[PDB]
Design an enzyme around this catalytic site. Structure first.
Site, PDB file in Angstrom:
ATOM      1  N   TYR A  71     -47.128  17.939  35.476  1.00  0.00           N
ATOM      2  CA  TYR A  71     -48.107  17.155  34.720  1.00  0.00           C
ATOM      3  C   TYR A  71     -48.945  18.022  33.770  1.00  0.00           C
ATOM      4  CZ  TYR A  71     -47.062  13.453  38.064  1.00  0.00           C
ATOM      5  OH  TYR A  71     -46.440  12.489  38.867  1.00  0.00           O
ATOM      6  N   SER A  98     -49.923  16.103  27.871  1.00  0.00           N
ATOM      7  CA  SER A  98     -51.372  15.998  27.996  1.00  0.00           C
ATOM      8  C   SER A  98     -51.903  16.720  29.212  1.00  0.00           C
ATOM      9  CB  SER A  98     -51.714  14.505  28.094  1.00  0.00           C
ATOM     10  OG  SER A  98     -51.057  13.930  29.224  1.00  0.00           O
ATOM     11  N   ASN A 139     -49.257   9.155  30.277  1.00  0.00           N
ATOM     12  CA  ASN A 139     -49.051   8.714  31.645  1.00  0.00           C
ATOM     13  C   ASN A 139     -50.038   7.581  31.941  1.00  0.00           C
ATOM     14  OD1 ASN A 139     -47.813   9.048  34.304  1.00  0.00           O
ATOM     15  ND2 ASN A 139     -49.842   9.548  34.976  1.00  0.00           N
ATOM     16  N   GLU A 140     -49.514   6.384  32.180  1.00  0.00           N
ATOM     17  CA  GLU A 140     -50.341   5.205  32.565  1.00  0.00           C
ATOM     18  C   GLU A 140     -51.599   5.027  31.696  1.00  0.00           C
ATOM     19  OE1 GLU A 140     -51.206   5.545  36.763  1.00  0.00           O
ATOM     20  OE2 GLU A 140     -49.035   5.299  37.217  1.00  0.00           O
ATOM     21  N   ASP A 181     -47.267   0.116  37.263  1.00  0.00           N
ATOM     22  CA  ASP A 181     -46.473  -1.030  37.676  1.00  0.00           C
ATOM     23  C   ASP A 181     -47.378  -2.244  37.890  1.00  0.00           C
ATOM     24  OD1 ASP A 181     -44.173  -2.456  38.507  1.00  0.00           O
ATOM     25  OD2 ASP A 181     -44.474  -1.827  40.626  1.00  0.00           O
ATOM     26  N   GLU A 239     -42.256   8.364  39.254  1.00  0.00           N
ATOM     27  CA  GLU A 239     -42.804   8.649  40.588  1.00  0.00           C
ATOM     28  C   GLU A 239     -42.216   7.608  41.519  1.00  0.00           C
ATOM     29  OE1 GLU A 239     -47.169   8.333  40.426  1.00  0.00           O
ATOM     30  OE2 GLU A 239     -47.255   9.984  38.971  1.00  0.00           O
TER      31      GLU A 239
HETATM   32  O1  LIG Z   1     -54.164   8.798  29.059  1.00  0.00           O
HETATM   33  C1  LIG Z   1     -54.534   8.046  30.207  1.00  0.00           C
HETATM   34  C2  LIG Z   1     -55.494   8.858  31.067  1.00  0.00           C
HETATM   35  O2  LIG Z   1     -54.867  10.127  31.375  1.00  0.00           O
HETATM   36  C3  LIG Z   1     -55.703  10.940  32.233  1.00  0.00           C
HETATM   37  O3  LIG Z   1     -55.051  12.205  32.472  1.00  0.00           O
HETATM   38  C4  LIG Z   1     -53.788  12.112  33.123  1.00  0.00           C
HETATM   39  C5  LIG Z   1     -54.010  12.347  34.620  1.00  0.00           C
HETATM   40  O4  LIG Z   1     -54.765  11.212  35.150  1.00  0.00           O
HETATM   41  C6  LIG Z   1     -52.668  12.501  35.351  1.00  0.00           C
HETATM   42  O5  LIG Z   1     -52.924  12.800  36.741  1.00  0.00           O
HETATM   43  C7  LIG Z   1     -51.720  12.896  37.538  1.00  0.00           C
HETATM   44  C8  LIG Z   1     -51.703  11.697  38.518  1.00  0.00           C
HETATM   45  O6  LIG Z   1     -51.613  10.481  37.757  1.00  0.00           O
HETATM   46  C9  LIG Z   1     -50.508  11.789  39.456  1.00  0.00           C
HETATM   47  N1  LIG Z   1     -50.589  10.897  40.631  1.00  0.00           N
HETATM   48  C10 LIG Z   1     -49.675  10.277  41.358  1.00  0.00           C
HETATM   49  C11 LIG Z   1     -50.352   9.685  42.331  1.00  0.00           C
HETATM   50  C12 LIG Z   1     -49.795   8.789  43.452  1.00  0.00           C
HETATM   51  O7  LIG Z   1     -49.981   7.378  43.152  1.00  0.00           O
HETATM   52  C13 LIG Z   1     -49.693   6.485  44.260  1.00  0.00           C
HETATM   53  C14 LIG Z   1     -49.665   5.133  43.858  1.00  0.00           C
HETATM   54  C15 LIG Z   1     -49.439   4.160  44.814  1.00  0.00           C
HETATM   55  C16 LIG Z   1     -49.416   2.835  44.439  1.00  0.00           C
HETATM   56  C17 LIG Z   1     -49.627   2.416  43.127  1.00  0.00           C
HETATM   57  C18 LIG Z   1     -49.871   3.372  42.164  1.00  0.00           C
HETATM   58  N2  LIG Z   1     -49.846   4.715  42.593  1.00  0.00           N
HETATM   59  N3  LIG Z   1     -51.619   9.978  42.190  1.00  0.00           N
HETATM   60  N4  LIG Z   1     -51.736  10.676  41.204  1.00  0.00           N
HETATM   61  O8  LIG Z   1     -50.567  13.023  40.141  1.00  0.00           O
HETATM   62  C19 LIG Z   1     -50.458  14.161  39.305  1.00  0.00           C
HETATM   63  C20 LIG Z   1     -50.379  15.396  40.245  1.00  0.00           C
HETATM   64  O9  LIG Z   1     -51.689  15.632  40.807  1.00  0.00           O
HETATM   65  C21 LIG Z   1     -51.612  14.229  38.306  1.00  0.00           C
HETATM   66  O10 LIG Z   1     -51.360  15.326  37.379  1.00  0.00           O
HETATM   67  O11 LIG Z   1     -51.892  13.548  34.751  1.00  0.00           O
HETATM   68  C22 LIG Z   1     -51.560  13.125  33.401  1.00  0.00           C
HETATM   69  C23 LIG Z   1     -50.574  14.111  32.798  1.00  0.00           C
HETATM   70  O12 LIG Z   1     -51.223  15.385  32.784  1.00  0.00           O
HETATM   71  C24 LIG Z   1     -52.820  13.137  32.575  1.00  0.00           C
HETATM   72  O13 LIG Z   1     -52.499  12.807  31.212  1.00  0.00           O
HETATM   73  C25 LIG Z   1     -57.043  11.211  31.563  1.00  0.00           C
HETATM   74  O14 LIG Z   1     -57.929  11.946  32.432  1.00  0.00           O
HETATM   75  C26 LIG Z   1     -57.728   9.928  31.182  1.00  0.00           C
HETATM   76  O15 LIG Z   1     -58.914  10.259  30.455  1.00  0.00           O
HETATM   77  C27 LIG Z   1     -56.809   9.075  30.314  1.00  0.00           C
HETATM   78  O16 LIG Z   1     -57.455   7.813  30.064  1.00  0.00           O
END
Ligand SMILES: OC[C@H]1O[C@@H](O[C@@H]2[C@@H](O)[C@H](O[C@@H]3[C@@H](O)[C@H](n4cc(COCc5ccccn5)nn4)O[C@H](CO)[C@H]3O)O[C@H](CO)[C@H]2O)[C@H](O)[C@@H](O)[C@@H]1O
EC number: 2.4.1.-
Length: 435
Positions: A71, A98, A139-140, A181, A239
């Site tokens: 990420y 990003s 991402n989302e 989703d 994922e």
């Molecule tokens: O653009 C948009 C935004 O994006 C946000 O940043 C993103 C940031 O929120 C995202 O976080 C990831 C994160 O989304 C991802 N992740 C996965 C999970 C598990 O989810 C379980 C689950 C269960 C059921 C339903 C849904 N999910 N939890 N986190 O884990 C990664 C490893 O830790 C993280 O890097 O990483 C992206 C790619 O680097 C970033 O772009 C940003 O902070 C904002 O301001 C900006 O509105």
């Protein structure tokens, strides 16, 4: 040497090994450390630290993965040691462009020189590696019906990342998107990212519908598979791994690589490698920096070992714009019209010629204040109406400086006194030198 990882290419809606011509299916896991910060980055880049990546690759090999999702990388650091080591085990990388502090802000979206610069930086750091499978442009970003207007900004970012790569000397690494989703938005999002003149190259869904000992029919996977049938670009689970029931059996893997899903989906990546007090890891790193394998590990290993997707070859496979979803208030508000490519030189001209500048909650206060005295239309960007101001692609500091300077010129004292009291404000002496 990268002989164990020939570059993967896209033909129609499938990935192919560029040498063998065999279809490529992703068998992946997310690989990213967090922290829980001035001199260090907020994010940690494990691919810039051989002591970390070289610890974990043997465990990744044990799992049987051929792909990681990463990420965030620090583009200022080298990655060849880790990328080469992954290549030696037949492993590829899907990489977000990003990072948490430089992303398209889904509640106040912009597509601008600051975010574009990040994206370019990542592309330039990572595109030399043949085992870089693809880039995610977001991402989302839109994640429900209240922020659908962020999606045109993401589409502009896809377009501009693809064009930057096209004009560079790099291999043409594909650029796609990773979506959530949400039921009310999912169909419109998937259509949006392949509609009109700009398309994602590939589409990842973060898919958590299958929990515990579920089935193809009852999970939702059969209906998802039906709806993505014939989608024009490769599609996969960026994922997966619902943790409702533990230890995760990962039986969704048998479905995902079975005959019914393998004709539609290009595989998927489990979330994730590291355990971070979120019950999502398959290993936990102890206080002595060693790897302790968690109860999920063997289950994922066994499922990936048994997965044997039957694809098609690039040669046997080889033998009209899609309409953008209509706008409906409170349901779908992403205009087909996209912001322009951010223009670093136009924006850099503000740095040179403006009388009053600001060095980078003050933005809200300052924009609210200045935009009651001058017309800020030139910096507004509206993804609903497709109206993007002439300077809306500049950095936030450039945008505020523009408005401050307009107020300075509107007052007309010409006395070098910038009309906002803050230590970050300064008169720009370059403005005096005869964009
Ligand atoms: O653009 C948009 C935004 O994006 C946000 O940043 C993103 C940031 O929120 C995202 O976080 C990831 C994160 O989304 C991802 N992740 C996965 C999970 C598990 O989810 C379980 C689950 C269960 C059921 C339903 C849904 N999910 N939890 N986190 O884990 C990664 C490893 O830790 C993280 O890097 O990483 C992206 C790619 O680097 C970033 O772009 C940003 O902070 C904002 O301001 C900006 O509105």
């Amino acid at each position: 040497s990268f002989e164990k990882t020939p570059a993967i290419k896209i033909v129609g809606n499938k990935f192919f090994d560029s040498e063998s011509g065999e279809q490529f299916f992703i068998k992946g896991i997310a690989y990213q450390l967090q922290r829980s910060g001035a001199f260090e980055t907020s994010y940690i880049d494990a691919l810039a630290d051989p002591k970390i990546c070289l610890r974990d690759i043997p465990f990744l090999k044990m799992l049987g993965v051929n792909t990681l999702r990463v990420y965030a990388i620090d583009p200022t650091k080298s990655h060849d040691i880790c990328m080469e080591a992954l290549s030696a085990e037949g492993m590829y990388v899907l990489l977000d462009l990003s990072e948490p502090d430089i992303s398209i802000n889904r509640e106040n979206p912009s597509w601008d020189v600051h975010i574009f610069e990040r994206y370019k930086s990542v592309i330039d750091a990572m595109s030399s590696f043949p085992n870089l499978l693809g880039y995610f442009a977001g991402n989302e970003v839109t994640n429900d019906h209240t922020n659908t207007f962020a999606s045109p900004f993401v589409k502009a970012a896809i377009r501009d990342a693809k064009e930057y790569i096209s004009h560079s000397n790099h291999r043409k690494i594909p650029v796609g998107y990773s979506t959530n989703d949400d039921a009310m938005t999912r169909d419109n999002l998937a259509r949006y990212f392949v509609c009109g003149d700009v398309k994602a190259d590939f589409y990842g869904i973060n898919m958590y519908e299958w929990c515990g000992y579920s089935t193809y029919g009852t999970s939702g996977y059969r209906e998802r598979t039906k709806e993505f049938e014939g989608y024009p670009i490769p599609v996969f689970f960026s994922e997966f791994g619902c943790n409702l029931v533990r230890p995760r059996p990962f039986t969704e893997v048998s479905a995902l690589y079975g005959n019914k899903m393998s004709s539609v989906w290009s595989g998927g990546l489990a979330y994730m490698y590291f355990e971070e007090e979120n019950e999502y890891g398959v290993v936990k790193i102890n206080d002595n920096d060693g790897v302790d394998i968690l109860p999920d590990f063997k289950n994922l290993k066994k499922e990936f070992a048994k997965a044997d997707p039957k694809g098609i070859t690039e040669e046997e496979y080889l033998t009209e714009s899609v309409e953008c979803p209509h706008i409906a208030v409170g349901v779908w508000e992403a205009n087909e019209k996209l912001p322009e490519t951010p223009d670093r030189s136009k924006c850099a001209c503000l740095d040179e010629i403006l009388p009053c500048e600001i060095v980078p909650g003050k933005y809200e206060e300052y924009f609210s204040y200045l935009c009651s005295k001058v017309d800020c239309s030139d910096i507004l960007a509206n993804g609903k109406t497709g109206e993007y101001g002439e300077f809306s692609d500049c950095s936030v500091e450039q945008k505020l400086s523009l408005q401050l300077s307009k107020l300075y010129c509107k007052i007309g004292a010409n006395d070098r006194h910038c009309p906002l009291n803050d230590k970050n404000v300064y008169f720009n002496l370059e403005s005096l030198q005869p964009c």
